[PDB]
Amino acid sequence: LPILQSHSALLENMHIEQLARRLPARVQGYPWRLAYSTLEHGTSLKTLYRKSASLDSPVLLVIKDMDNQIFGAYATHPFRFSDHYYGTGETFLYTFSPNFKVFKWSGENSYFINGDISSLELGGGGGRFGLWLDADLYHGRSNSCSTFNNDILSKKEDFIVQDLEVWTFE
Amino acid sequence: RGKLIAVIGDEDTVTGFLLGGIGELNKNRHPNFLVVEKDTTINEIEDTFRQFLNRDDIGIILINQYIAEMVRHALDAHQRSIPAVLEIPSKEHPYDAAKDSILRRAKGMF
Amino acid sequence: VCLFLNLANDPTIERIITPRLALTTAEFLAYQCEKHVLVILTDMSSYAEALREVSAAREEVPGRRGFPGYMYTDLATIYERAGRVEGRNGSITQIPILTMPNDDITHPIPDLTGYITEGQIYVDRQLHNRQIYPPINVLPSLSRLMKSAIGEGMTRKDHADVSNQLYACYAIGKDVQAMKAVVGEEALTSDDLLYLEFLQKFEKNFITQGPYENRTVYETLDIGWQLLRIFPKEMLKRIPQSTLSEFYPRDS
Amino acid sequence: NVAGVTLPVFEHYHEGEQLAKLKRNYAKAVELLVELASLQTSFVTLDEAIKITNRRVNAIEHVIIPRIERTLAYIITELDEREREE
């Protein structure tokens, strides 16, 4: 019943079980491949976009902060540099806090994913982001945004990435 | 606009590359192909090959290798990169092997 | 701090006396009061200008390049008032500071100083023009005694490995940065693009520091690991597997 | 472009069943030939630029640098003479 992965490091089986119940029909019954990991490939946003640039299927983002909280997003499109917001309403944010919560689209706006040379972010609605990351994958921020109506995904609004992974279904 | 491709061949690979849509005849009514019929004089397959080689409208020249070989003199003497001469294979005469005028640049390497 | 000031229009004999008062004080503080003394001697190039003048006043003939022929034995009498000694818990460490004409290392003052002292720290006009401070260039710089100062019980066990790997990455980064202008950035490999990212972040975070910002060696080594973590750990060939296992991963 | 050398290349553009099969089977041949002439116009142009570059690397190593070193050795020798005269 639990899914097949080609390796793993931030997720234990109880995280795999609870995520795999929620992923869309698009990606049910596919093995998970590790596209990027800070622990395998070194730590930078330019490396994350470089490893993602060949992809053409959805991705799961997993983050562990320095307070050990696990959170991230499921995103309908790979993380790429974009002039404007992109993605579709099957995108969601999630956290284990320590109980698993998932914040699917509110229907209010389509500000799902935005990538820049110096940051990656998800959500919108004023100055808010459900998840923002710096060029180093060192500082990030999470606050409630009206795209997802999310909680704070970390233990704090402002956080340090301990480590980060991007998985693709392929 | 753009260049043409030109063809210097046995009659069957001038029906090939012509049922392929290559090649015109210009406003001066100069053609774009040569047909090496069996009694062709050896000069002819140079006389037109030099005309193609220094026209402006020809981008590629396609030559069946056995009649590049009849002019191996004039053909290896082309040092420029402007019209590219492809030594294609033929029918019953054996296919493209060694002896190609361009591959020879890599003498210690191919 | 004990401070001795000799100004540009003080007597030129007071400039000859100044290093000798300073070192006679450091010898009392180190070898009688058992302190570790740091001695900073500022423009040994200004000292040599006064030495050449006292030499001319004695009516001596000018030596090689216009300085006194005995200028090695004179500078060595200043610089060898240094060290640790048996049975006393103090020491004297010297940092001479020198200005070179034409940025030329082959002039008598830096050249004779190189035969007596054991290393150099090199201050660079290009880093200064690029608005970096302190503009210290680590590629021509060397401390010849560094292996005796660093490691377990003296700094941290990884210090030698981090120092070797940061030097090796910077020496490659400057070479990739040169070929980028020849081959263009689309011909660079993924590993060249990692050295090109390290090069920028090394100069902005490790070398660039505030004039009132103080980093312990532990903070310096931690800033060193933040930069080494740009690379896959297979790239870090100057660092042994035991050091990579203890220090490459982040922790809460 | 390759290291600042510009290479010429070519781009193809286009203006009963046995005859249709023949039209396919020849049209797919001119798609090799217009590719292969892009490789041969590149190759013959790239061979020239390597020779010109290797000749400059040799001239700097064998002709230009030694003339500078002989000049620089003469200057040091003449400055020792002026010092000994003085």
Coordinates of C-alpha atoms in Angstrom, one line a residue:
Chain A
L1 CA 0.0 0.0 0.0
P2 CA 2.7 2.7 0.8
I3 CA 4.4 4.1 -2.3
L4 CA 7.8 3.3 -3.8
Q5 CA 10.7 5.7 -3.5
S6 CA 14.2 5.4 -5.1
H7 CA 15.8 6.7 -1.8
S8 CA 14.7 9.0 1.2
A9 CA 16.0 11.3 4.1
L10 CA 13.6 14.0 5.5
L11 CA 10.4 11.7 5.4
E12 CA 9.8 8.7 7.7
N13 CA 7.1 6.1 6.7
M14 CA 4.3 7.8 8.8
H15 CA 5.0 11.0 6.7
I16 CA 4.9 9.0 3.4
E17 CA 1.6 7.3 4.4
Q18 CA -0.2 10.6 5.2
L19 CA 1.1 12.4 2.1
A20 CA 0.3 9.6 -0.3
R21 CA -3.4 9.6 0.8
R22 CA -3.6 13.2 -0.4
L23 CA -1.7 13.4 -3.7
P24 CA -3.9 13.9 -6.8
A25 CA -5.1 11.2 -9.2
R26 CA -2.4 12.5 -11.6
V27 CA 0.4 11.0 -9.5
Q28 CA -1.2 8.1 -7.6
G29 CA 0.6 4.8 -8.5
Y30 CA 3.9 6.4 -9.7
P31 CA 7.3 5.8 -8.1
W32 CA 8.9 8.9 -6.4
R33 CA 12.3 10.1 -7.7
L34 CA 14.6 12.5 -5.8
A35 CA 15.1 15.5 -8.2
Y36 CA 17.0 17.7 -5.7
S37 CA 18.3 17.4 -2.1
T38 CA 20.5 19.8 -0.2
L39 CA 22.2 16.8 1.4
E40 CA 23.0 15.1 -2.0
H41 CA 23.6 18.1 -4.3
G42 CA 24.8 21.0 -2.2
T43 CA 22.7 23.9 -1.0
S44 CA 21.6 26.6 -3.5
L45 CA 18.4 27.9 -5.2
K46 CA 20.4 28.0 -8.6
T47 CA 21.1 24.2 -8.2
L48 CA 17.4 23.6 -7.3
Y49 CA 16.3 25.3 -10.6
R50 CA 19.2 23.6 -12.6
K51 CA 18.1 20.1 -11.3
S52 CA 14.4 21.0 -12.0
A53 CA 14.9 22.4 -15.5
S54 CA 14.5 19.1 -17.4
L55 CA 11.2 18.0 -15.6
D56 CA 7.7 17.9 -17.1
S57 CA 5.5 16.5 -14.2
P58 CA 4.4 17.6 -10.7
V59 CA 6.7 17.9 -7.7
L60 CA 6.6 17.6 -3.9
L61 CA 8.7 20.0 -1.9
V62 CA 9.9 18.9 1.6
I63 CA 11.5 21.2 4.1
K64 CA 12.9 20.6 7.6
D65 CA 13.6 23.8 9.5
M66 CA 16.1 24.2 12.4
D67 CA 13.2 23.6 14.9
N68 CA 12.8 20.1 13.1
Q69 CA 9.3 20.9 11.8
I70 CA 8.4 19.2 8.4
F71 CA 6.4 21.1 5.9
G72 CA 6.3 22.1 2.2
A73 CA 4.1 22.0 -0.9
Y74 CA 2.8 19.8 -3.6
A75 CA 3.0 21.8 -6.9
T76 CA 1.5 21.0 -10.3
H77 CA 4.6 22.4 -12.2
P78 CA 8.4 22.2 -11.7
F79 CA 10.1 25.2 -9.9
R80 CA 11.3 27.4 -12.7
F81 CA 12.2 31.2 -13.2
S82 CA 8.9 32.9 -14.2
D83 CA 7.9 36.5 -15.0
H84 CA 4.4 35.9 -13.6
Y85 CA 2.6 33.5 -11.2
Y86 CA 2.0 29.9 -12.6
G87 CA 0.5 26.6 -11.5
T88 CA -3.1 25.3 -11.0
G89 CA -5.6 24.6 -8.2
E90 CA -4.4 21.1 -7.4
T91 CA -1.4 22.8 -5.8
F92 CA -1.4 22.6 -2.0
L93 CA 0.7 23.5 1.1
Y94 CA 1.2 21.1 4.0
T95 CA 2.7 20.7 7.5
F96 CA 3.2 18.2 10.2
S97 CA 2.7 20.3 13.3
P98 CA 3.1 17.6 14.7
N99 CA -0.3 16.4 13.3
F100 CA -0.6 16.4 9.5
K101 CA -2.5 19.4 7.9
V102 CA -3.0 20.2 4.2
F103 CA -4.1 23.6 2.9
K104 CA -5.7 23.2 -0.6
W105 CA -6.7 26.1 -2.8
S106 CA -9.2 28.6 -1.3
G107 CA -10.6 29.5 -4.8
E108 CA -9.8 33.2 -4.1
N109 CA -6.7 33.8 -6.3
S110 CA -4.4 31.9 -8.6
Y111 CA -1.0 33.1 -7.2
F112 CA 0.2 29.5 -6.8
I113 CA 4.0 29.5 -7.7
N114 CA 6.4 32.3 -8.4
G115 CA 10.2 31.9 -9.0
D116 CA 12.9 34.6 -9.2
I117 CA 16.7 34.7 -9.5
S118 CA 16.9 35.4 -5.7
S119 CA 13.8 33.6 -4.3
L120 CA 11.1 31.0 -4.6
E121 CA 7.6 31.5 -3.2
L122 CA 4.1 30.1 -3.1
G123 CA 0.8 31.9 -2.6
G124 CA -0.2 35.5 -2.7
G125 CA -2.9 38.1 -1.5
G126 CA -1.3 41.4 -0.5
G127 CA 2.4 41.1 0.8
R128 CA 1.8 37.6 2.2
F129 CA 3.3 34.3 1.0
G130 CA 2.4 30.8 2.3
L131 CA 6.0 29.9 1.8
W132 CA 9.1 32.0 0.6
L133 CA 12.7 30.9 0.3
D134 CA 15.9 32.9 -0.3
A135 CA 18.7 32.4 -2.9
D136 CA 20.8 30.4 -0.4
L137 CA 18.0 28.1 0.8
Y138 CA 18.9 29.5 4.2
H139 CA 16.3 32.0 5.3
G140 CA 12.6 31.4 4.6
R141 CA 9.2 32.8 5.7
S142 CA 5.7 31.5 6.1
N143 CA 2.5 33.5 6.8
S144 CA -1.2 32.9 6.0
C145 CA -2.0 33.9 2.4
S146 CA -5.4 33.9 0.8
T147 CA -4.4 31.5 -2.0
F148 CA -4.4 28.6 0.5
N149 CA -5.7 30.1 3.8
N150 CA -2.8 28.3 5.5
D151 CA -1.4 28.3 9.0
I152 CA 2.3 29.2 9.7
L153 CA 3.9 26.1 8.1
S154 CA 7.0 26.2 10.4
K155 CA 7.3 26.7 14.2
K156 CA 7.9 30.4 13.5
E157 CA 7.0 33.0 10.8
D158 CA 10.7 33.5 10.1
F159 CA 12.8 30.3 9.9
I160 CA 16.1 28.7 8.9
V161 CA 16.1 25.7 6.5
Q162 CA 17.9 22.8 8.1
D163 CA 17.5 20.8 4.9
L164 CA 15.3 20.6 1.8
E165 CA 14.2 18.1 -0.9
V166 CA 12.3 18.2 -4.2
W167 CA 10.7 14.9 -5.4
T168 CA 9.2 14.3 -8.8
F169 CA 6.7 11.6 -10.0
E170 CA 8.3 9.8 -12.9
Chain B
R1 CA 15.4 33.9 -50.5
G2 CA 18.1 31.3 -49.4
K3 CA 20.5 29.1 -51.4
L4 CA 19.7 26.1 -53.5
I5 CA 21.2 22.6 -53.2
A6 CA 22.9 21.3 -56.4
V7 CA 23.1 17.7 -57.7
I8 CA 25.9 16.0 -59.8
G9 CA 24.8 12.4 -60.3
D10 CA 23.9 9.4 -62.2
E11 CA 20.4 9.9 -63.8
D12 CA 18.6 7.8 -61.0
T13 CA 20.0 10.1 -58.2
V14 CA 18.9 13.1 -60.3
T15 CA 15.3 11.7 -60.3
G16 CA 16.0 11.2 -56.6
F17 CA 16.7 14.7 -55.2
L18 CA 14.2 16.0 -57.8
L19 CA 11.1 14.1 -56.8
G20 CA 12.6 15.4 -53.4
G21 CA 11.9 19.1 -54.5
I22 CA 15.5 20.3 -54.6
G23 CA 16.8 22.5 -57.4
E24 CA 15.5 25.0 -60.0
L25 CA 16.7 26.6 -63.2
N26 CA 17.5 30.3 -62.8
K27 CA 16.5 33.5 -64.7
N28 CA 19.5 33.0 -67.1
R29 CA 18.1 29.4 -67.6
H30 CA 21.2 27.8 -66.1
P31 CA 20.2 24.5 -64.5
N32 CA 20.9 23.1 -61.1
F33 CA 22.0 19.5 -61.8
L34 CA 24.2 17.4 -64.0
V35 CA 23.5 13.9 -65.4
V36 CA 26.7 11.8 -65.9
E37 CA 25.3 9.6 -68.7
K38 CA 27.8 6.7 -69.6
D39 CA 29.5 8.5 -72.5
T40 CA 30.1 11.8 -70.5
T41 CA 33.5 13.4 -71.3
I42 CA 35.7 13.6 -68.1
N43 CA 36.0 17.4 -68.5
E44 CA 32.2 17.9 -68.1
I45 CA 32.1 16.7 -64.5
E46 CA 34.7 19.4 -63.7
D47 CA 33.4 22.1 -66.1
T48 CA 30.1 22.4 -64.3
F49 CA 31.5 21.5 -60.9
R50 CA 33.7 24.6 -61.1
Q51 CA 30.6 26.6 -62.2
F52 CA 28.7 25.5 -59.1
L53 CA 31.8 25.9 -56.9
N54 CA 32.0 29.7 -57.7
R55 CA 28.3 30.6 -58.1
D56 CA 26.6 32.5 -55.2
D57 CA 23.3 30.7 -55.3
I58 CA 24.5 27.1 -54.6
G59 CA 24.7 26.2 -50.9
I60 CA 25.3 22.4 -51.0
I61 CA 26.7 20.2 -53.8
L62 CA 25.6 16.5 -53.7
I63 CA 28.0 14.3 -55.8
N64 CA 27.8 10.5 -56.2
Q65 CA 31.2 9.4 -54.9
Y66 CA 32.4 7.6 -58.1
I67 CA 32.2 10.9 -60.0
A68 CA 33.8 12.9 -57.3
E69 CA 36.6 10.4 -57.9
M70 CA 36.8 11.3 -61.7
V71 CA 37.6 14.9 -60.5
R72 CA 39.4 14.1 -57.1
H73 CA 41.9 16.7 -58.4
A74 CA 39.5 19.7 -58.6
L75 CA 37.4 18.5 -55.6
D76 CA 40.1 18.1 -52.9
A77 CA 41.4 21.5 -54.0
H78 CA 38.3 23.2 -52.5
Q79 CA 39.7 24.5 -49.1
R80 CA 36.8 26.9 -48.3
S81 CA 33.6 26.2 -46.3
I82 CA 31.2 28.1 -48.6
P83 CA 29.5 25.4 -50.8
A84 CA 29.6 22.1 -48.9
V85 CA 30.4 19.1 -51.2
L86 CA 28.7 15.9 -49.9
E87 CA 30.1 12.7 -51.5
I88 CA 26.9 10.6 -51.4
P89 CA 26.7 6.9 -52.3
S90 CA 25.4 5.5 -55.6
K91 CA 23.3 2.4 -56.8
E92 CA 25.4 -0.7 -57.7
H93 CA 28.7 1.0 -57.3
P94 CA 29.8 0.5 -53.6
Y95 CA 28.7 2.9 -50.8
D96 CA 30.5 5.8 -49.1
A97 CA 33.7 4.4 -47.4
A98 CA 37.2 6.0 -46.9
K99 CA 38.5 8.3 -49.7
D100 CA 36.1 11.2 -48.7
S101 CA 37.7 14.7 -49.3
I102 CA 36.5 16.3 -46.0
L103 CA 36.9 13.5 -43.4
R104 CA 40.7 13.4 -44.3
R105 CA 41.3 16.5 -42.0
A106 CA 41.1 14.2 -39.0
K107 CA 44.0 11.9 -40.3
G108 CA 45.3 10.8 -36.8
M109 CA 41.9 10.9 -35.1
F110 CA 39.0 9.3 -37.0
Chain C
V1 CA 47.9 48.5 25.0
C2 CA 51.1 50.4 25.2
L3 CA 51.2 52.9 22.4
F4 CA 54.3 54.7 20.9
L5 CA 53.7 57.4 18.3
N6 CA 56.4 58.9 16.1
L7 CA 55.1 61.5 13.7
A8 CA 56.3 62.4 10.1
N9 CA 58.0 65.6 11.4
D10 CA 59.4 64.3 14.7
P11 CA 63.3 63.9 14.8
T12 CA 64.5 61.0 12.6
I13 CA 66.6 59.5 15.5
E14 CA 63.3 59.1 17.5
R15 CA 62.2 56.9 14.6
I16 CA 65.4 54.8 15.0
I17 CA 64.7 54.6 18.8
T18 CA 60.9 53.9 18.5
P19 CA 61.1 50.1 17.6
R20 CA 63.8 49.7 20.3
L21 CA 61.6 51.3 23.1
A22 CA 58.7 49.1 21.9
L23 CA 60.7 45.9 21.9
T24 CA 62.5 46.7 25.2
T25 CA 59.0 47.0 26.7
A26 CA 57.7 43.8 25.0
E27 CA 60.8 41.9 26.4
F28 CA 60.0 43.1 30.0
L29 CA 56.3 42.2 29.7
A30 CA 56.9 38.8 28.0
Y31 CA 60.0 37.4 29.7
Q32 CA 59.7 39.0 33.2
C33 CA 55.9 39.4 33.7
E34 CA 55.0 36.2 31.7
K35 CA 52.5 37.9 29.2
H36 CA 51.8 36.9 25.6
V37 CA 52.7 40.2 23.8
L38 CA 51.6 41.2 20.3
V39 CA 53.8 43.8 18.8
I40 CA 52.6 45.8 15.8
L41 CA 55.4 47.9 14.0
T42 CA 53.9 50.3 11.5
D43 CA 55.7 51.3 8.3
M44 CA 59.1 49.6 8.6
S45 CA 59.4 51.5 5.2
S46 CA 59.3 54.7 7.3
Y47 CA 62.0 53.3 9.6
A48 CA 64.3 52.5 6.7
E49 CA 64.0 56.1 5.4
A50 CA 65.4 57.4 8.8
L51 CA 68.1 54.6 8.8
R52 CA 69.3 55.8 5.3
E53 CA 69.5 59.4 6.7
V54 CA 71.5 58.5 9.8
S55 CA 73.8 56.5 7.5
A56 CA 74.2 59.5 5.2
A57 CA 75.0 61.8 8.3
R58 CA 77.9 59.4 9.2
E59 CA 79.3 60.1 5.6
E60 CA 79.0 56.4 4.6
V61 CA 78.7 55.6 0.8
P62 CA 75.1 54.5 -0.2
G63 CA 74.7 50.7 -0.6
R64 CA 72.7 48.4 -2.9
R65 CA 69.6 50.3 -4.2
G66 CA 70.5 53.4 -2.0
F67 CA 70.0 51.7 1.4
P68 CA 72.8 51.0 3.9
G69 CA 74.7 47.7 3.2
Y70 CA 74.1 46.7 6.8
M71 CA 70.3 47.0 6.6
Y72 CA 69.7 43.2 6.8
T73 CA 71.6 43.0 10.2
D74 CA 69.7 46.1 11.4
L75 CA 66.2 44.7 10.5
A76 CA 67.1 41.3 11.9
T77 CA 68.0 43.0 15.2
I78 CA 64.4 44.2 15.3
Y79 CA 62.6 41.1 14.0
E80 CA 64.5 38.5 16.0
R81 CA 63.3 40.1 19.3
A82 CA 60.5 37.6 19.2
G83 CA 59.5 34.0 20.2
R84 CA 58.8 31.7 23.1
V85 CA 61.7 30.9 25.6
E86 CA 62.3 27.8 27.8
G87 CA 61.0 28.0 31.5
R88 CA 58.9 31.3 31.1
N89 CA 55.2 31.3 30.3
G90 CA 55.2 34.5 28.1
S91 CA 56.0 35.1 24.4
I92 CA 56.5 37.9 21.8
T93 CA 54.7 37.8 18.4
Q94 CA 55.5 40.5 15.8
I95 CA 53.3 41.9 13.0
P96 CA 55.5 44.3 11.0
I97 CA 53.6 46.4 8.5
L98 CA 55.2 47.7 5.3
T99 CA 54.5 49.9 2.2
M100 CA 56.1 48.8 -1.1
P101 CA 56.9 51.3 -4.0
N102 CA 55.4 50.5 -7.4
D103 CA 53.6 47.5 -5.7
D104 CA 57.0 45.8 -6.2
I105 CA 57.9 42.8 -3.8
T106 CA 61.6 42.8 -5.1
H107 CA 62.6 46.1 -3.5
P108 CA 65.2 45.7 -0.6
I109 CA 62.7 46.5 2.2
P110 CA 60.1 43.7 1.5
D111 CA 62.8 41.4 0.1
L112 CA 65.1 41.5 3.2
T113 CA 62.0 41.3 5.4
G114 CA 61.1 38.0 3.6
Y115 CA 64.5 36.4 4.4
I116 CA 64.0 37.1 8.2
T117 CA 60.2 36.7 8.8
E118 CA 58.1 33.5 8.3
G119 CA 55.1 34.3 6.0
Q120 CA 53.3 37.2 4.4
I121 CA 49.8 38.7 4.5
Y122 CA 49.2 40.5 1.2
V123 CA 47.0 43.7 0.9
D124 CA 45.6 44.1 -2.6
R125 CA 44.8 47.2 -4.8
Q126 CA 42.2 45.3 -6.9
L127 CA 40.0 44.1 -3.9
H128 CA 40.3 47.7 -2.6
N129 CA 39.2 49.2 -5.9
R130 CA 36.3 46.6 -5.9
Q131 CA 35.2 48.2 -2.6
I132 CA 36.0 45.1 -0.5
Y133 CA 37.4 45.4 3.0
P134 CA 39.7 44.2 4.4
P135 CA 41.3 43.8 0.9
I136 CA 43.5 40.8 1.9
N137 CA 44.4 38.5 -1.0
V138 CA 44.6 34.9 0.2
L139 CA 46.3 33.3 -2.9
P140 CA 49.8 35.0 -2.5
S141 CA 49.5 35.2 1.3
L142 CA 51.0 32.5 3.5
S143 CA 51.6 31.7 7.2
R144 CA 54.6 29.2 7.4
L145 CA 53.8 28.2 11.0
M146 CA 49.9 27.7 10.5
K147 CA 50.1 23.9 11.2
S148 CA 51.6 24.7 14.6
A149 CA 48.8 27.1 15.7
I150 CA 45.6 25.1 14.6
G151 CA 43.8 21.9 15.2
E152 CA 42.5 19.9 18.2
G153 CA 43.0 21.6 21.6
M154 CA 44.3 24.8 19.8
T155 CA 41.4 25.8 17.6
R156 CA 39.0 23.1 16.2
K157 CA 39.9 19.6 14.6
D158 CA 38.6 20.6 11.1
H159 CA 40.5 23.9 10.7
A160 CA 43.4 22.5 8.6
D161 CA 40.9 20.7 6.2
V162 CA 38.6 23.8 5.9
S163 CA 41.6 26.1 5.2
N164 CA 42.9 23.7 2.5
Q165 CA 39.5 23.3 0.9
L166 CA 38.6 27.0 0.9
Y167 CA 42.0 27.8 -0.8
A168 CA 41.5 25.0 -3.4
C169 CA 37.9 26.3 -4.2
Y170 CA 39.0 29.9 -4.6
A171 CA 42.0 29.0 -6.8
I172 CA 39.6 27.1 -9.1
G173 CA 36.9 29.8 -8.9
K174 CA 39.3 32.5 -10.2
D175 CA 40.3 30.2 -13.1
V176 CA 36.6 29.5 -14.1
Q177 CA 35.9 33.2 -13.8
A178 CA 38.7 33.8 -16.4
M179 CA 37.6 31.2 -18.9
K180 CA 33.9 32.5 -18.6
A181 CA 35.0 35.5 -20.7
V182 CA 36.6 33.3 -23.3
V183 CA 34.1 30.4 -23.7
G184 CA 30.9 32.2 -22.6
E185 CA 28.6 31.1 -19.7
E186 CA 26.6 28.6 -21.9
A187 CA 29.8 26.4 -22.3
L188 CA 30.5 26.2 -18.5
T189 CA 29.6 22.8 -16.9
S190 CA 27.4 22.4 -13.8
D191 CA 30.6 22.1 -11.7
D192 CA 31.9 25.4 -13.2
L193 CA 28.6 27.1 -12.2
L194 CA 29.2 25.8 -8.6
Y195 CA 32.7 27.3 -8.5
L196 CA 31.2 30.5 -10.0
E197 CA 28.6 30.7 -7.2
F198 CA 31.2 29.9 -4.4
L199 CA 33.5 32.6 -5.7
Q200 CA 30.9 35.4 -5.3
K201 CA 29.7 34.2 -1.8
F202 CA 33.2 33.6 -0.5
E203 CA 34.2 37.3 -1.3
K204 CA 30.9 38.7 0.1
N205 CA 30.8 36.7 3.3
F206 CA 34.2 35.2 4.2
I207 CA 36.6 38.0 3.0
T208 CA 34.3 41.0 3.4
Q209 CA 34.0 41.9 7.1
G210 CA 33.2 45.2 9.0
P211 CA 36.0 47.4 10.5
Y212 CA 34.2 47.0 13.9
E213 CA 32.9 43.4 13.3
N214 CA 34.9 40.8 15.4
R215 CA 34.7 37.0 14.5
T216 CA 36.1 34.3 16.7
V217 CA 38.0 31.5 14.9
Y218 CA 34.8 29.4 15.6
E219 CA 32.6 31.9 13.8
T220 CA 35.2 32.1 11.0
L221 CA 35.1 28.3 10.6
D222 CA 31.3 28.2 10.7
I223 CA 31.2 30.8 7.9
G224 CA 33.7 28.6 6.1
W225 CA 31.3 25.6 6.3
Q226 CA 28.3 27.6 5.0
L227 CA 30.3 28.1 1.8
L228 CA 31.6 24.6 1.5
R229 CA 28.0 23.3 1.7
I230 CA 27.4 24.9 -1.7
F231 CA 29.1 21.8 -3.2
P232 CA 28.1 18.1 -3.3
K233 CA 30.3 16.5 -0.6
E234 CA 32.1 14.4 -3.3
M235 CA 33.7 17.7 -4.6
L236 CA 35.4 18.4 -1.2
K237 CA 38.5 16.3 -2.1
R238 CA 40.9 18.1 0.4
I239 CA 38.7 17.1 3.3
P240 CA 38.8 13.5 4.8
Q241 CA 35.7 11.4 5.2
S242 CA 35.8 11.7 9.1
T243 CA 35.7 15.6 9.0
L244 CA 33.0 15.5 6.3
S245 CA 30.9 13.1 8.5
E246 CA 31.1 15.4 11.6
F247 CA 30.8 18.9 9.9
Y248 CA 29.2 18.8 6.4
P249 CA 25.6 18.2 7.7
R250 CA 23.6 21.1 9.4
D251 CA 22.2 20.4 12.9
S252 CA 19.5 22.0 15.2
Chain D
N1 CA 29.2 30.4 -31.7
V2 CA 32.1 28.4 -30.1
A3 CA 34.5 30.3 -27.8
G4 CA 33.9 33.5 -29.9
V5 CA 34.4 31.8 -33.3
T6 CA 31.3 32.0 -35.4
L7 CA 30.4 28.9 -37.4
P8 CA 28.2 28.9 -40.5
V9 CA 25.3 26.3 -40.5
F10 CA 22.2 25.6 -42.7
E11 CA 18.5 25.5 -42.1
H12 CA 16.1 23.5 -44.3
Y13 CA 12.8 25.3 -45.2
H14 CA 10.1 24.1 -47.6
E15 CA 8.3 26.4 -50.0
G16 CA -0.3 7.4 -56.7
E17 CA 0.7 5.7 -53.3
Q18 CA 4.1 4.4 -54.7
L19 CA 5.0 8.0 -55.8
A20 CA 4.0 9.3 -52.3
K21 CA 6.2 6.5 -50.7
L22 CA 9.0 7.7 -53.0
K23 CA 8.4 11.4 -52.0
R24 CA 8.6 10.4 -48.3
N25 CA 11.7 8.2 -48.9
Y26 CA 13.6 11.0 -50.7
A27 CA 12.4 13.9 -48.5
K28 CA 13.7 12.0 -45.4
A29 CA 17.1 11.8 -47.2
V30 CA 17.5 15.6 -47.8
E31 CA 16.9 15.9 -44.1
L32 CA 20.2 14.0 -43.5
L33 CA 22.0 15.9 -46.2
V34 CA 21.1 19.4 -45.1
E35 CA 22.1 18.3 -41.5
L36 CA 25.4 16.8 -42.7
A37 CA 26.3 19.9 -44.6
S38 CA 25.8 21.9 -41.4
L39 CA 28.3 19.6 -39.7
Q40 CA 30.8 19.8 -42.6
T41 CA 30.5 23.7 -42.9
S42 CA 31.1 23.8 -39.2
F43 CA 34.0 21.3 -39.2
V44 CA 35.9 23.0 -42.0
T45 CA 35.4 26.4 -40.4
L46 CA 36.4 25.2 -36.9
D47 CA 39.6 23.5 -38.2
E48 CA 40.9 26.8 -39.5
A49 CA 40.3 28.6 -36.2
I50 CA 42.1 25.9 -34.1
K51 CA 45.2 26.4 -36.4
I52 CA 45.2 30.2 -36.0
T53 CA 44.9 29.8 -32.2
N54 CA 47.6 27.2 -31.8
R55 CA 49.9 29.4 -33.9
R56 CA 49.3 32.3 -31.4
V57 CA 49.9 30.1 -28.4
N58 CA 53.2 29.0 -30.0
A59 CA 54.2 32.5 -31.0
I60 CA 53.6 33.8 -27.5
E61 CA 55.6 31.0 -26.0
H62 CA 58.5 30.9 -28.5
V63 CA 58.8 34.4 -29.9
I64 CA 57.1 37.1 -27.8
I65 CA 57.8 36.0 -24.1
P66 CA 61.6 35.3 -24.7
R67 CA 62.1 38.8 -26.2
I68 CA 60.5 40.4 -23.1
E69 CA 62.7 38.2 -20.8
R70 CA 65.9 39.2 -22.7
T71 CA 64.9 42.9 -22.5
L72 CA 64.2 42.6 -18.8
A73 CA 67.6 40.8 -18.1
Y74 CA 69.5 43.6 -20.0
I75 CA 67.8 46.4 -18.0
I76 CA 68.8 44.7 -14.7
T77 CA 72.4 44.3 -16.0
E78 CA 72.6 48.0 -17.0
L79 CA 71.2 49.3 -13.7
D80 CA 74.0 47.4 -11.9
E81 CA 76.5 49.3 -14.1
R82 CA 75.0 52.7 -13.3
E83 CA 75.1 51.8 -9.6
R84 CA 78.8 50.8 -9.8
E85 CA 79.7 54.0 -11.7
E86 CA 77.9 56.1 -9.1

